[PDB]
Design a protein around this ligand. Structure first.
Ligand SMILES: Nc1nc2c(ncn2[C@H]2C[C@H](O)[C@@H](COP(=O)(O)OP(=O)(O)OP(=O)(O)O)O2)c(=O)[nH]1
Ligand SMILES: [Ca+2]
Ligand SMILES: [Ca+2]
Ligand SMILES: [Ca+2]
Length: 341
DNA sequence: CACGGAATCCTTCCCCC
DNA sequence: GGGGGAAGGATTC
């Protein structure tokens, strides 16, 4: 079983460079402006010129500017990156019928057939890297291993613009040497929980009673880590399908006034519906980000599909339900549609 | 100072054999 | 007791 994972380098920023080469070599910061005030918002991503100075995804735009006041700041253009991403996924498809598009810039390929060993896998990787660079002029990192997880870990190790194979010999040393926090699916919350249990390496998950592990991080997560640690994780590359579409926006000022919030909510529904394109949802959820960045939501599932009029009507009720049950002011408001017919 | 889309899994009900 | 779902939240990429 050989999996090849492809992860595009500093994607949003690299696309902006491709579309305007004069940016190359300079620090480029792709931002999401919230409109609350001068430069309010977060950084979606930045190229490596900017990252070596601390500017990276997640930090506030205002803080990025204090560090790199002369960098180039650009508004994120999601749609454009999505279309470039699509073209790249189509190139990868020609290397394997079994492909898993994990996100706007990640994909796993089951090349167990196309190749007979790791040496050949590596060469297919270079072939893929070269093809993408030539065709779209975008550099990517390739990870290759026994399964999806280590394939991803491989890429994480070799980026940017790299390629790496993690052989069965290395898998084992990683199972005993890799910081468990570096395992995909293990965020800050799960890592801390695992620390308190004395587990700092995948190998430590076998020196614990299952039920105690399950009780701490959940069964699904417990079985996941245990299979990896036992070198038995073996999930298949499957084509994922969109299950929900939605949109959430930030209001200029926090609020509790139904008539002040409605506009942002209806705007979110509008964009959500234009995106549903032919897909009809039976479920709707109104999502709110309180002033203390907490996330609360109220939704409803219907026995039939939801017409746009119904969505406008039902969303107002759900928003009223939110305000009634939660006294905090609202900062971000939006909707999400799911359970497509 | 901290935007944004979405999948999955966990708890707590709730209806009903 | 447990199958079947729905809600609201937790967690991660
Ligand atoms: N709005 C927003 N977009 C994000 C955020 N974090 C990541 N993204 C986008 C950034 C990338 O263009 C794309 C994710 O790839 P990362 O896995 O983020 O890789 P990126 O390509 O930026 O880093 P890299 O140098 O290739 O390893 O998802 C975030 O916090 N906010
Ligand atoms: Ca990337
Ligand atoms: Ca990625
Ligand atoms: Ca981590």
């Amino acid at each position: 079983m050989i999996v090849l994972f492809v992860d595009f380098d500093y994607f949003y920023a690299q696309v902006e460079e491709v579309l305007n080469p004069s940016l190359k070599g300079k620090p480029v910061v792709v931002c999401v402006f919230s409109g609350r005030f001068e430069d309010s918002g977060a950084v979606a991503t930045a190229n490596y010129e900017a990252r070596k100075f601390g500017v990276k995804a997640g930090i506030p735009i205002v803080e990025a500017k204090k560090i790199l006041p002369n960098a180039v700041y650009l508004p994120m253009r999601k749609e454009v990156y999505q279309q470039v991403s699509s073209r790249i996924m189509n190139l990868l498809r020609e290397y394997s019928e079994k492909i898993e598009i994990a996100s706007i810039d990640e994909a796993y390929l089951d090349i167990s057939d196309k190749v007979r060993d790791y040496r050949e896998a590596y060469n297919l990787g270079l072939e893929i890297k070269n093809k993408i660079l030539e065709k779209e002029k975008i550099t990517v990192t390739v990870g290759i291993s026994k399964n999806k997880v280590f394939a991803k870990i491989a890429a994480d190790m070799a980026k940017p613009n790299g390629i790496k194979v993690i052989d069965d010999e290395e898998v084992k040393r990683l199972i005993r040497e890799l910081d468990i926090a570096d395992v995909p699916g293990i965020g800050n919350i799960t890592a801390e929980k695992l620390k308190k249990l004395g587990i700092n390496k995948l190998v430590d998950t076998l020196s614990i009673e299952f039920d105690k592990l399950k009780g701490m991080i959940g069964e699904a997560k417990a079985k996941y880590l245990i299979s990896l640690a036992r070198d038995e994780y073996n999930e298949p590359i499957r084509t994922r399908v969109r299950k929900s579409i939605g949109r959430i926006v930030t209001m200029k000022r926090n609020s509790r006034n139904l008539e002040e919030i409605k506009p942002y909510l209806f705007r979110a529904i509008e964009e959500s519906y234009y995106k549903l394109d032919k897909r009809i949802p039976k479920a709707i959820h109104v999502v709110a980000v309180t002033e203390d960045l907490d996330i609360v939501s109220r939704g409803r599932t219907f026995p039939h599909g939801i017409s746009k009029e119904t969505a406008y009507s039902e969303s107002v009720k759900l928003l009223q339900k939110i305000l009634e049950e939660d006294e905090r002011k609202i900062r971000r408001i939006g909707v999400r549609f799911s359970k497509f017919i």
